[PDB]
Amino acid sequence: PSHKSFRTKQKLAKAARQNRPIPQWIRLRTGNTVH
Amino acid sequence: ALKTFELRKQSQENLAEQLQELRQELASLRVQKIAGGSGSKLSKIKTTRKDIARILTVINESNRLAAREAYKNKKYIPLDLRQKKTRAIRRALTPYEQSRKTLKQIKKERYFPLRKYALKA
Amino acid sequence: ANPRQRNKQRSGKPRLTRRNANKKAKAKIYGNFVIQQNWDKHATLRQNYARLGLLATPNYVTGGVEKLYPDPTLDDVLDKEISIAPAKTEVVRQ
Amino acid sequence: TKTWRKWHVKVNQNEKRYAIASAVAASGVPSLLLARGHRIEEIPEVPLVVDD
Amino acid sequence: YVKTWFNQPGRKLRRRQARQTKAAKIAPRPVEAIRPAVKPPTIRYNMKVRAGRGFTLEELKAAGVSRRVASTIGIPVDHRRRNRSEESLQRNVERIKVYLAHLIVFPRKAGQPKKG
Amino acid sequence: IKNKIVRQQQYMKALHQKNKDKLERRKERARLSENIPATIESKRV
Amino acid sequence: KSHTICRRCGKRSFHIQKSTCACCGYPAAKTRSYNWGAKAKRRRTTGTGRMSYLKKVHRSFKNGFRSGKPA
Amino acid sequence: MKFSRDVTSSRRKQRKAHFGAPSSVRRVLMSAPLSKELREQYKIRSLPVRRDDQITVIRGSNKGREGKITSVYRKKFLLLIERVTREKANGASAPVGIDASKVVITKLHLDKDRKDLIVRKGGKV
RNA sequence: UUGACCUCAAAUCAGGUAGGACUACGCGCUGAACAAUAAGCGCAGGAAAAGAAAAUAACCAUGAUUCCCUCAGUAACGGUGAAGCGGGAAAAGCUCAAAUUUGAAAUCUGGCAACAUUUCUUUUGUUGUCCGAGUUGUAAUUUCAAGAAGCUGCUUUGAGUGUAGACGAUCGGUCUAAGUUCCUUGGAACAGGACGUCAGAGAGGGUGAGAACCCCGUCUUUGGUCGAUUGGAUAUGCCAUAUAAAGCGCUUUCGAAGAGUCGAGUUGUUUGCAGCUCUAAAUGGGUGGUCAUCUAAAGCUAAAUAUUGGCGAGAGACCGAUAGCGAACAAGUAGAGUGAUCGAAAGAUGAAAAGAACUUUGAAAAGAGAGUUAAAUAGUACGUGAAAUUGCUGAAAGGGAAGCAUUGGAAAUCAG
RNA sequence: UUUCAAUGGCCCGUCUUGAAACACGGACCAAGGAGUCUAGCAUCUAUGCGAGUGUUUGGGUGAUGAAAACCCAUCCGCGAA
RNA sequence: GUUUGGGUAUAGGGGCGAAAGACUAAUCGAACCAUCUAGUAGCUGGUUC
RNA sequence: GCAGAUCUUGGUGGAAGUAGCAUUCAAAUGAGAACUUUGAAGACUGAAGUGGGGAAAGGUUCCAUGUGAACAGCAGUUGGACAUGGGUUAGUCGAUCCUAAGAGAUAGGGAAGCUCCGUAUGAAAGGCACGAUUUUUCGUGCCUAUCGAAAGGG
RNA sequence: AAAACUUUCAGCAACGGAUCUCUUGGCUCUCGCAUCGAUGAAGAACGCAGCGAAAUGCGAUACGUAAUGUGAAUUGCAGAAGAAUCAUCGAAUCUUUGAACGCACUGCGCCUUUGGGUUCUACCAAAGGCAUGCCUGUUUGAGUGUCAUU
Ligand SMILES: [Zn+2]
């Protein structure tokens, strides 16, 4: 909805930003994983 | 950067003006990062952050040593200045009162303590 | 395999390793100085007591003892006074 | 599998002493040492006894 | 429920080290206290002699040891046992007397105030 | 990446990123005298 | 929606009408737990989070919880 | 044979400890022998490798090469020695890492700490 | 009027303290269907609980508790199922109530003040002073094993505070023998051969292939050295409120001992315990067999014992990626369900990324030459690469099944 | 080895019945997958000892792995009426 | 040709009995979850050179 | 030690390329145009919209740029896809405040207990003024929870 | 009766992921030790790196600060030069929550002190406080509770 608590805005933003491509240089430092 | 020993060789208001100066410098460097900066400036950000931490550390320890000096030899001192081992250890009987004995038991160990001896084969 | 053990397996903080266990290490002698100076740390306490001239126990022993070599009427006694006991070894004499 | 499987075996102390006596006597037989796999082809004597 | 015994050799060693730890502390005196000689209570075992708990008050008095100093020099006291025959008395009185003859008691440092 | 599915996924993203950028420069560019395929014969001692 | 986010455990198991979490029993002082729920216990027990303070205590024990500064 | 209950002979534990070692521990792990001349001069058989040390590769395809250590790559247990490189396809040079045990230190980068370390290990300077 | 006291309130009063979590082991409570079980509820500790006989026994007696073995599948009870004795492990004992200090509340919290002390400016006290608590009873003294009070003449004695050195314990840094000589194979020697060296070290691991001698280690070490913090003794200094306090031994003097508890009746649970009604005694009461034994209705207590958890350590005739934990890897993760809950699949390029520059074709993905490598029959759709199955080429067969067996022929191919 | 010729050759397991046939299982391959451990009793065989027999509750002891091996005080089990 | 949104309260089997009360239930009719449980098999299917 | 357990897990077949799933013209862009874009023509909903808004609900799904891996019972130059950035501004609009039916802590009382009943209940249930200051120790007088409405009140 | 098609055999290539070897994992046994929380735990949420999504670490001092040890790194790139994504660890920091504590669950209060401003009886900010039960003491009370007071 619209009348959303501010914690929800942080909660929604973090959940969405988890779906983000893992950087190329990240792989170059041995190993980094998903999920 | 900032060395901790020469930081500790200064006064509190001098440490405050240094902290204010460093916070300004950090703010300018983060402005440079959004406007497009060089690796030197981006590397200077971390050093400034650690330098702020060192100044804050020195200020806080000087403040707390003053509190420890003020409360030295007082029956009651602030909770953050008291020991923090565990909750259970703080509730335990002290070695003094854990060793308190009745006069009856004091007389027994005074007159009939465990003796030193040996048995010949 | 526990959640609390998987917690520090995936952690970067090192395990609080302590190195204290060395079996066969017998407790060192404090207490008597004369006994300490004549105690050989390898031997057992029964071997040490017998070598020093002392009795480890004043009662019977509850088992076979080691054999390393081929070994070669109230009133009268209630009133008698046992004439001390000889000191076999030097440590007992000391 | 259970940990209370029988791991240790009882042997009469007399049979153990029998087998140890038989093992020592076999050690004094040069032909059994060779079949065992020992390179004792130049040993001066069996049983081999050295000074103290 | 099945009770296993894989800690049997471990329990054996741990008890040996406890004797060693005890001897490490009380170094010259024996690791065990002296026990009395008692006769088991039944018609099947009364011909034997086994170790009792402690020496009776009558046994200690005949042996000259006060009940207060007995515990100090390692002589246990059994306030519950009594001597119904003089054979039990003589058996354990001489046990105490032999123990005393083989005993070396080390002196103690005492407090001595300057005045009377 | 010790996780085989993740290291594969990052490689495929890396491969697509590399191939896309290689032809980003290739189309921008579009030399023959200088850039010539080096062979074993050309590398013979 | 019959459940919302619980303030204590952060899971979407807080029943709006009963005003009670089906997971941890919030707002009861004690946490909901059951011995028939062995897998449920291991999902939220000690070690599933940070244990920031317990790691400090375990690390401080060896030296006897000493305080002060080195010489 | 090892007789201490404080040391483990387990392969699983030894390989975990080796590849889980922090940099301060890998610093000891990355040790090289001292040359014959340095050995009779300092009375020390081996030392940890340190940057700018002068070494000679003893084993491998680069057996015989010499140069200074331009980097000790502790996180991979590798020594990058100057001029010991590999030519990639595009013409760039990728330095070839050598295990610290496969080189020999011909000249040391002496400091006050290294001299203190040398005399500490029953040595002379 | 004034003031004592009792009872009961209030304060963001001074200072404390409780909760929740973990929960393997431990103690209570509750408790089924098919077991002093599971589930539920309460409360602990490093152990818990139990514990110094209202105990056994019937003996020549034993002597707190706990635990192990035995008793013993015995007695009993009608399949259930002990205990005493015996053998061992460990051992340690005790404190109150009931007494007039009565020639002296001798007792204690707190405030304030100094002074010390410290795992510690964080801890812990001491001394003084003041207000309170307390006579509706705080100390000393006594606990039945006794004991008090007198008497006696022997034997006794610190709840101090330093220093020194020794002996232990804990923590942290530090110290450590010998090939990388020769030849062969290989991308690499750690392989084979030769000549040697060390070993109180020939465990294990690492390093480009099986390394005692290259490296970390290992042995020495059942120790050196450096600190740090402690423990119980020893020697010694100072202090010591002893006009004191004890043990033993004597008696022409005394000796208190726990109640809605025991018990009886009756109703539940399994003699013990709970409810209910009734309700004691003083050589009394309990328990066993006139006798023996014990002394309830108050309290504490180390060790031997337990320990799927916690902090660590060492192992294994264990499993080897469909196994072993659900999870060797992003594993209680992704994902599913309104929810309680449910819950996977997924390890291996190479010694090194040297991960394929460059040219060409294509819009691109890719292809082809090329290149790296010991190897691309190692190209990340990456070790090895089975079968099912599929395409291709070769050979042959085929009129409504096919497989198979036997005997030979032909073709191909082997010993030869 | 493939193929041809002549000759022979009913689909395997399971279940039911005197017996079949039914009926049930079977698309194919790989990997996994079912008389195990333990307590008691009994028989037989072997081994040790023998009117005796049984070390491993426990103790002793074990420097080289010490959970091993080695030693055995008092009991107790069974037997000998 | 009076419905409804949001918020809400809450009694909930059966016969017996004039009622009251009981006599067993219930959490109503049930559902789902997890444990007990590896409940109860004279049976079915399979059981490896 | 497997051929079978309507066996377990994974892989793969025949069935089978089978069952099946109101626009037209020119132009532009593009490697590529039955499906994109523009213009023309022809049609469809016809104010009860295929219209324009909000609540609840979703959570970035809005916009711009790029790409055409996976989606697309077809495809795309394409999607609510992927990637990169941007975007929500209030003294007056809502919430915030009030109360509703009800819930609910407190007082008390049950209950072996997790907890239950109880909401002005036999609760000491909290205020205001006065005064040359009153034996510089305060007298006199008066009156007597919270939650629950983004649709109610303001 | 040639081809196609079907089948068989062999070769090659696919498909698949068995086998073999391995293994920072699991499982089992034994041994040592005893340490959560109102001085805010376990758990939850949100944040923090020059370039970071998970995991790890940490908490606005935010992949760490102090101190001590070691002695020259980190490493994917850039950049920097008592270094360190090092070790130890006795000093600190430690957001919002949670037994969770002013009251509620976007918020709404009260008390004390201090400060700011281009505006000072206004507004704003900061810091420190305000849960419940119980104990000891303190202070202030109440009672037609028990009394005393020539
Ligand atoms: Zn919750």
Alpha helices by DSSP H, listed for chain G, are 38-42, 52-61
Residue E4 beta carbon within 7 A of nucleic strand M: yes
Instruction: Confirm whether residue G9 is marked as ligand binding.
Output: yes
Contact yes or no for E13 and C57 at CB 8 A: no
CB of G6 within 8 A of CB of G13? yes
Give the span between the Cα atoms of H45 and H42, in whole angstroms: 9
CB of C52 within 8 A of CB of C92? yes
- D2 to chain E: which residues are within 8 Å by CB? 2
For residue H101, give the nearest of H4, H26, H19 by alpha carbon: H26
How far away, in angstroms, is C2 Cα from ligand 1 center? Answer: 23
In degrees rounded to 5, what are phi and psi of residue C64? -65, 145
In degrees rounded to 5, what are phi and psi of residue H105? -80, 115
Q: Write down the domain spans for chain B.
A: 1-75, 76-120
- How many contacts, defined by CB atoms under 8 Å, are there between C and H? 9
CB of C59 within 8 A of CB of E34? yes
**Given its phi and psi angles, is residue G25 left (phi above 0), alpha (psi -120 to 50 degrees) or beta?**
left
3-state secondary structure chain E: CCCCCCCHHHHHHHHHHHHHHHHHHCCCCCCCCCCCEECCCCCCCCCCCEECCCECHHHHHHCCCCHHHHHHCCCCECCCCCCCCHHHHHHHHHHHHHHHHCEEEECCCCCCCCCC
Contact yes or no for H6 and C14 at CB 8 A: no
3-state secondary structure C49-91: HHHHCECCCCCCCCCCCCCCCCCCCCHHHHHCCCCCCCCCCHH
Q: What is the β-pairing status of strands H46-48 and H54-57?
A: unpaired
Give the span between the Cα atoms of E93 and G50, in whole angstroms: 68
Which residue of chain C has the CA closest to H22? C14
- Report CA(D1)–C1'(J54) in Å, whole number: 31
How far away, in angstroms, is A11 Cα from ligand 1 center? Answer: 16
CB of C53 within 8 A of CB of B121? yes
Helix, strand, coil shares of chain C as percentages rounded to 5? 30, 0, 70
- Inspect the structure and tell me whether chains B and F have 3 or more CB pairs less than 8 Å apart: no
For A15-25, letters b (16+ CB in 10 Å) and e give: eeeeeeebeee
Q: Write down the domain spans for chain H.
A: 1-125
Give the span between the Cα atoms of D46 and E34, in whole angstroms: 53
Give the span between the Cα atoms of E100 and C82, in whole angstroms: 9
| End-to-end Cα distance, chain D | 51
Whether the bond into G27 is cis, omega within 30 of 0: yes
Residue E13 beta carbon within 7 A of nucleic strand I: no
Strand partners of residue B120: C54
For B5-18, letters b (16+ CB in 10 Å) and e give: eebeeeeeeebeeb
Q: Which residues does E89 contact at the CB level (< 8 Å), separation at least 6? A: C74, C78, E58, E59, E62, E83
Give the span between the Cα atoms of B76 and B99, in whole angstroms: 24
Cα-based distances in Å from F25 to F12, F15, F35, F36: 20, 16, 16, 18
Give the span between the Cα atoms of C18 and B121, in whole angstroms: 42
For D16-52, letters b (16+ CB in 10 Å) and e give: eeeeeeeeeeeeeeeeebeeeeeeeeeeeeeeeeeee
CB of D33 within 8 A of CB of D41? no
Give the span between the Cα atoms of H108 and H39, in whole angstroms: 11
Question: If DSSP codes are grouped into helix, strand and coil, which group holds residue G49?
Answer: coil
Whether the bond into D47 is cis, omega within 30 of 0: yes
Mutation target vs C (from H2, H3, H4, H6; most C CBs, 10 A cutoff): H6
In degrees rounded to 5, what are phi and psi of residue C40? -95, 120
* Number of other CB atoms surrounding residue B81 within 10 Å: 13
| End-to-end Cα distance, chain F | 40
- G65 to chain B: which residues are within 8 Å by CB? 85-86, 89
Question: If DSSP codes are grouped into helix, strand and coil, which group holds residue D34?
Answer: helix
- How many contacts, defined by CB atoms under 8 Å, are there between A and F? 29
Give the span between the Cα atoms of E110 and B115, in whole angstroms: 13
Chain B span 69-88 residues with beta carbon within 7 Å of strand I: 69, 72-73, 75-77, 81-85, 87-88
Supply G53's token pair.
Answer: 């303070």
Q: What is the β-pairing status of strands H66-73 and G20-21?
A: unpaired
Chain H span 4-23 residues with beta carbon within 7 Å of strand M: 11-12, 15-16, 19-20, 22-23
| End-to-end Cα distance, chain H | 35
CB of B78 within 8 A of CB of B71? yes
Strand partners of residue E105: B117
Give the span between the Cα atoms of B57 and D7, in whole angstroms: 62
For residue H110, give the nearest of H58, H30, H38, H26 by alpha carbon: H38
For residue B28, give the nearest of B39, B19, B37 by alpha carbon: B37
For residue E64, give the nearest of E103, E33, E32, E26 by alpha carbon: E103
Give the span between the Cα atoms of B59 and B67, in whole angstroms: 13
